Amino acid sequence: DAHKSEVAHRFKDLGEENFKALVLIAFAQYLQQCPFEDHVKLVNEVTEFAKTCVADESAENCDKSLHTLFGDKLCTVATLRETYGEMADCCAKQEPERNECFLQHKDDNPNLPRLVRPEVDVMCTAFHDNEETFLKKYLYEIARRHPYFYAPELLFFAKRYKAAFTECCQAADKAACLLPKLDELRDEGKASSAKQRLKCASLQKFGERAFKAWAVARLSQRFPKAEFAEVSKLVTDLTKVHTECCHGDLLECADDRADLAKYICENQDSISSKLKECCEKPLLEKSHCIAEVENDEMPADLPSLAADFVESKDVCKNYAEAKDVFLGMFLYEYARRHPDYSVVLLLRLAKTYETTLEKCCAAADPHECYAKVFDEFKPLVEEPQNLIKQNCELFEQLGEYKFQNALLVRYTKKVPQVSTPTLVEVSRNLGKVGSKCCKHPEAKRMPCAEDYLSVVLNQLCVLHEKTPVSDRVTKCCTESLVNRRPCFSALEVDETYVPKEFNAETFTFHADICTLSEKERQIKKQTALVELVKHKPKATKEQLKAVMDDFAAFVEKCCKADDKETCFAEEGKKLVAASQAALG
Ligand SMILES: c1ccc(CN(Cc2ccccn2)Cc2cccc(-c3ccccn3)n2)nc1
Ligand SMILES: CCCCCCCCCCCCCCCC(=O)O
Ligand SMILES: CCCCCCCCCCCCCCCC(=O)O
Ligand SMILES: CCCCCCCCCCCCCCCC(=O)O
Ligand SMILES: CCCCCCCCCCCCCCCC(=O)O
Ligand SMILES: CCCCCCCCCCCCCCCC(=O)O
Ligand SMILES: CCCCCCCCCCCCCCCC(=O)O
Ligand SMILES: CCCCCCCCCCCCCCCC(=O)O
Ligand SMILES: [Cl-]
Ligand SMILES: [Cl-]
Ligand SMILES: [Cl-]
Numbered sequence: 001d002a003h004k005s006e007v008a009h010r011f012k013d014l015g016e017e018n019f020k021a022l023v024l025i026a027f028a029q030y031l032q033q034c035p036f037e038d039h040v041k042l043v044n045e046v047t048e049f050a051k052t053c054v055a056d057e058s059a060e061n062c063d064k065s066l067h068t069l070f071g072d073k074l075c076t077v078a079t080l081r082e083t084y085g086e087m088a089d090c091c092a093k094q095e096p097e098r099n100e101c102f103l104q105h106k107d108d109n110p111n112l113p114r115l116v117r118p119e120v121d122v123m124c125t126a127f128h129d130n131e132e133t134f135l136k137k138y139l140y141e142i143a144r145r146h147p148y149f150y151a152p153e154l155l156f157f158a159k160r161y162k163a164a165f166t167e168c169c170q171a172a173d174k175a176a177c178l179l180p181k182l183d184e185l186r187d188e189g190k191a192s193s194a195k196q197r198l199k200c201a202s203l204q205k206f207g208e209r210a211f212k213a214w215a216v217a218r219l220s221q222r223f224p225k226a227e228f229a230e231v232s233k234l235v236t237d238l239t240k241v242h243t244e245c246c247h248g249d250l251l252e253c254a255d256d257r258a259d260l261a262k263y264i265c266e267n268q269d270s271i272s273s274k275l276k277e278c279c280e281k282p283l284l285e286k287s288h289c290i291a292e293v294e295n296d297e298m299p300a301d302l303p304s305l306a307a308d309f310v311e312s313k314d315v316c317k318n319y320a321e322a323k324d325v326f327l328g329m330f331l332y333e334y335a336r337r338h339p340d341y342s343v344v345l346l347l348r349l350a351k352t353y354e355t356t357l358e359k360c361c362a363a364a365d366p367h368e369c370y371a372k373v374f375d376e377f378k379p380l381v382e383e384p385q386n387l388i389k390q391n392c393e394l395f396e397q398l399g400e401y402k403f404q405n406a407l408l409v410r411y412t413k414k415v416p417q418v419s420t421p422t423l424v425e426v427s428r429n430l431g432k433v434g435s436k437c438c439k440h441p442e443a444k445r446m447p448c449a450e451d452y453l454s455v456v457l458n459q460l461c462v463l464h465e466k467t468p469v470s471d472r473v474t475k476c477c478t479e480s481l482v483n484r485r486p487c488f489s490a491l492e493v494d495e496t497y498v499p500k501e502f503n504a505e506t507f508t509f510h511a512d513i514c515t516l517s518e519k520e521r522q523i524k525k526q527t528a529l530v531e532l533v534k535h536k537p538k539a540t541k542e543q544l545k546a547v548m549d550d551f552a553a554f555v556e557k558c559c560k561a562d563d564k565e566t567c568f569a570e571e572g573k574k575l576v577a578a579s580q581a582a583l584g
């Protein structure tokens with residue numbers, strides 16, 4: 001029906017190197033606790049066998065589906081019963097139940113130590129002696145910690161990491177080049193892991209119609225020179241894709257992804273003209289590239305949306321004829337015109353239209369009833385543009401670090417009850433969001449913000465369901481996609497909070513504060529700022545500036561000083577004592 005040998009088709013399709021790396025990521029995600037060692041033979045054997053099928057597709061065993069091959073290898077591991085336990089009982093089953101059985105014993109978050117990043121001298125020296133082992137061991141370590149991370153995407157990050165190593169490992173200050181590049185693409189790797197978990201939960205926590213409206217909006221921004229009927233074809237295929245990808249089967253998700261890229265690339269002309277570099281790329285990178293394509297230009301003279309949606313007499317019956325399709329046509333016309341909008345803003349608008357149409361298409365004079373609906377959109381539009389305008393001018397006046405401290409005070413007062421490391425991690429993340437996004441002009445600021453906020457805001461919510469501390473954070477995390485952010489933006493100062501018991505040790509500073517990296521230094525300052533607010537919640541902004549002003553003096557005096565360890569302990573007891581009286 002399909003190819004005679006699946007393994008051969010994919011070996012020639014991918015190439016040996018991509019095949020080897022991808023086979024290893026798959027077994028790494030399924031047998032996370034086995035030594036690096038075991039996987040390298042497993043991949044070698046899988047790769048020896050695949051080559052025999054490239055030579056002869058009618059050779060031994062080459063006609064079994066890759067799924068069969070995959071489980072067959074998993075069950076040859078002899079430690080499977082002792083190390084994986086009930087995961088070995090899946091071998092008692094036959095296909096297709098066996099694969100579906102291995103599928104649900106993938107361990108979302110297993111118990112592995114956090115990888116400690118060795119020094120730049122020792123990384124570069126290791127990358128030289130054995131490039132292969134260095135890069136593949138780290139692929140194994142990351143895949144065993146991220147079992148649901150799409151394998152092709154993990155391979156793309158590994159190739160970027162390799163690029164950093166090949167370039168920065170032959171420089172004068174290797175660390176000056178390597179470290180920012182590993183921080184950038186580790187935060188990127190953490191941000192992409194979060195997008196993947198968010199979308200899958202979004203699928204089911206808000207509904208398919210909410211999801212389907214999301215993708216209608218997004219696809220209309222990306223492809224404005226395309227018909228609503230092409231867009232809604234693509235929305236439907238994409239929902240199939242995401243549904244089997246979130247389910248977890250790598251092969252099933254990758255086939256579905258490739259077929260969609262092949263379709264998109266055949267029907268380029270009716271879709272978008274920004275699409276020729278991705279379609280000349282190999283099968284593996286095709287959908288990767290199409291996923292990240294720039295928005296096509298909007299058709300030049302587009303009419304006002306008020307004809308089809310306000311002034312036409314037929315709106316109320318075209319709507320009631322097929323309510324959702326009409327709302328999706330509203331959504332597509334509004335979106336193709338506004339790639340400067342966040343998707344969720346466009347969903348607020350379509351939902352506001354919708355709420356106005358059920359009210360107004362019951363009236364006698366509906367056109368009279370809804371002639372101010374388009375007026376209604378504009379404060380919805382104004383709200384996020386303005387808190388962006390406001391927060392990017394703050395960032396511009398304070399620089400990243402001082403802006404992050406502004407946010408620390410803001411969110412500690414809003415939600416005092418949160419752990420102080422978490423307050424620091426999130427206010428540090430938001431400041432990086434402002435650094436990334438405020439470098440766009442206004443026309444691209446709102447998509448940027450939603451792109452990064454939605455992962456920060458979801459990582460915050462998965463953390464909260466685990467260790468709950470605030471009902472007002474539970475509220476916002478359980479609301480509709482469209483109300484998630486405006487809920488957070490509406491959190492006010494907890495005026496029911498009781499100040500924290502003052503603890504002396506938490507505001508004393510030893511001699512290490514000088515000998516620390518620029519990062520760690522800031523972290524310990526920010527940790528104390530939080531605990532200062534947690535103890536002085538009704539401190540004013542000016543009082544706080546005095547307390548942090550005198551503190552900053554206190555470090556610069558007892559760090560240029562010939563005796564460090566004793567100016568800190570004495571000029572600090574005075575600071576703690578002066579601060580307690582300045583506040584209160
Ligand atoms: C890792 C992380 C993020 C991305 C997203 N990519 C979109 C893109 C646009 C055109 C062609 C391929 N990828 C942007 C980008 C930046 C740097 C490298 C690559 C890349 C290189 C090879 C394969 C896949 N990606 N990609 N890719 C890999
Ligand atoms: C702590 C950083 C260690 C150095 C990086 C190792 C370079 C090769 C790694 C291959 C796969 C990398 C995928 C990382 C994604 C993530 O950070 O979640
Ligand atoms: C024992 C064999 C198991 C491994 C089988 C090889 C499968 C390689 C991974 C398939 C994805 C390749 C195409 C990517 C699809 C896409 O996202 O465009
Ligand atoms: C990783 C995105 C899905 C897989 C790629 C299949 C073909 C490209 C799809 C382009 C859609 C661009 C918008 C982002 C996807 C979304 O709406 O969630
Ligand atoms: C066939 C495409 C579907 C189009 C549906 C358009 C509906 C517009 C209303 C916006 C809904 C987004 C918010 C979801 C709220 C919810 O379902 O709880
Ligand atoms: C400008 C980004 C960094 C700012 C850090 C804290 C303030 C975040 C609020 C700004 C963006 C809000 C709009 C997001 C998308 C939407 O809800 O439509
Ligand atoms: C478990 C973690 C709890 C963290 C909750 C504290 C709130 C931190 C800030 C998140 C809201 C940011 C989005 C809107 C920005 C704004 O208007 O301030
Ligand atoms: C009740 C008061 C207790 C004593 C408080 C002592 C001072 C704590 C200061 C911690 C905030 C650090 C501010 C960093 C700003 C900067 O780097 O200039
Ligand atoms: Cl093919
Ligand atoms: Cl060399
Ligand atoms: Cl050499």
Ligand SMILES: [Cl-]
Pocket residue numbers: 182183184186187
């Ligand atoms: Cl990092």
Ligand SMILES: [Cl-]
Pocket residue numbers: 193194197
């Ligand atoms: Cl996650």
Ligand SMILES: [Cl-]
Pocket residue numbers: 198199202214
């Ligand atoms: Cl999403």
Ligand SMILES: [Cl-]
Pocket residue numbers: 026070249250251
């Ligand atoms: Cl699989």
Ligand SMILES: [Cl-]
Pocket residue numbers: none
């Ligand atoms: Cl490229």
Ligand SMILES: [Cl-]
Pocket residue numbers: none
């Ligand atoms: Cl009229």
Ligand SMILES: [Cl-]
Pocket residue numbers: 318319326
């Ligand atoms: Cl219609």
Ligand SMILES: [Cl-]
Pocket residue numbers: none
């Ligand atoms: Cl407009």
Ligand SMILES: [Cl-]
Pocket residue numbers: 337338339340443
């Ligand atoms: Cl625009």
Ligand SMILES: [Cl-]
Pocket residue numbers: 310311367371
């Ligand atoms: Cl009118």
Ligand SMILES: [Cl-]
Pocket residue numbers: 418419422467469
């Ligand atoms: Cl917490």
Ligand SMILES: [Cl-]
Pocket residue numbers: 389441442
């Ligand atoms: Cl602006």
Ligand SMILES: [Cl-]
Pocket residue numbers: 425426429455456457459460
């Ligand atoms: Cl977070």
Ligand SMILES: [Fe+3]
Pocket residue numbers: 128
């Ligand atoms: Fe060499």
Ligand SMILES: [Fe+3]
Pocket residue numbers: 156288
């Ligand atoms: Fe890429």
Ligand SMILES: [Fe+3]
Pocket residue numbers: 311371
């Ligand atoms: Fe009129």
